[PDB]
Amino acid sequence: STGSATTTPIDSLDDAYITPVQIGTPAQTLNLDFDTGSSDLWVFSSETTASEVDGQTIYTPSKSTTAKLLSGATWSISYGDGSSSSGDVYTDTVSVGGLTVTGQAVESAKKVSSSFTEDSTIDGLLGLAFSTLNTVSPTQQKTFFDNAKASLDSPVFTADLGYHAPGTYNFGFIDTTAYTGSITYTAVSTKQGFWEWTSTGYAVGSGTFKSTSIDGIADTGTTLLYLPATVVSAYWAQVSGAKSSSSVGGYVFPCSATLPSFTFGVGSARIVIPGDYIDFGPISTGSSSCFGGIQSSAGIGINIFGDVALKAAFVVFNGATTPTLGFASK
C-alpha cells in the first residue's frame, strides 16, 4: 500500500504545515501538523476543555462507529517551544492520503496550552519520530508510520515541503519525479528517538564550504533552523545590521537586507537554502526589524533541521531495520 497527501502552510510565513487526516467512521477530517520530532497522534476533541478550543475542528469519538476507549491510557506531552497537551486515548481507523491504519491510537486532548488554542488552523499533531518517544501510559503506543509500515510497499515516508506553497507527504514510495539529481542517504541514530543525523558542514552565501560535523534532527514540526552559535554567528555576520536581540529572542536583521543563502552538507552532497527562505518578516506588524530563520541552538541542547532547511530538499525518512535519511535537491 501507499498514501499521498498534500501539506499546506498555515500562514504566509510557513510557520507550520497542515495535512488532512481522516479519523473514524464515518470519516472526520482534521488538519494535523505532521511532526517528525515527536511520536504522539493527538487531536482536539469533544473532550477538550471548552475554553481551550477556538476554531479548531474536533474529533468526536462518540460519533465514530470504530472508536474504542483504550481503557486506562493517558498521555501528556511537552514540546521544545514550551507548549503542551494531555488527555486520554481511543483507538480508531486513521487514513492519510488513501493509506489506512486500523487500531491507531488517537490521543484525545482534555487540555492544551495557549499556543495550541490560539492557532485555529491546527487540529492536532501526527507524530512521525520513533515510537519510543510516544507518551501514552501505561502502555506505550505506535505511531501511524510504525503501524502502517508492514503494509507499505517500501518502509519509507517522504517530506516535500513547499516554500510559500503546498507540498506533499508520501508513504510507502519514493516519487522519482519530485526531485532533481540523486538522493544522498546518511546514517540515523535512533538513540534519542529522533531522526538524528550528522551534517558534514556548511557554507554561507558564495563562501567556502566548512567541513565540520553537525549532529541534529530532521524535524518537520519545528519552523526554523537551529544550529551551533559559531555557525549562526558566521551566517549573520554577512548581513549588515544583523544582531542577536535578547528582547526579541534571537537574531534580527534590517528588513531592507538581501539575505545570503545557507548551504548544509549531506555526505558529499550539498543542499542550498535560498536567502529568501531565511526571512521570517517583521518582528511585529509594521516593524523594519525582521526575524531570522537561522537561530542558535545553544540552550536547546540539540541542533534542529526544521522546516527552513527541510523545505529546500526532498527528504526521505527510511524506516527500514537500519533507518537512514535521504536528501535531494528539487
Swiss-Prot record:
Its EC number is 3.4.23.22. The active site is at residues 35, 199. The keyword Ubl conjugation does not apply. It catalyses: Hydrolysis of proteins with specificity similar to that of pepsin A, prefers hydrophobic residues at P1 and P1', but does not cleave 14-Ala-|-Leu-15 in the B chain of insulin or Z-Glu-Tyr. Clots milk. GO terms for biological process: proteolysis. Keywords: Aspartyl protease, Disulfide bond, Hydrolase, Protease, Signal, Zymogen. Disulfide bonds join 255-290. Transmembrane segments: none annotated. It comes from the Eukaryota. Residues 17-328 form the Peptidase A1 domain. One of its GO terms (molecular function) is aspartic-type endopeptidase activity. The keyword Signal applies. Belongs to the peptidase A1 family. This is Endothiapepsin. The gene is EAPA.
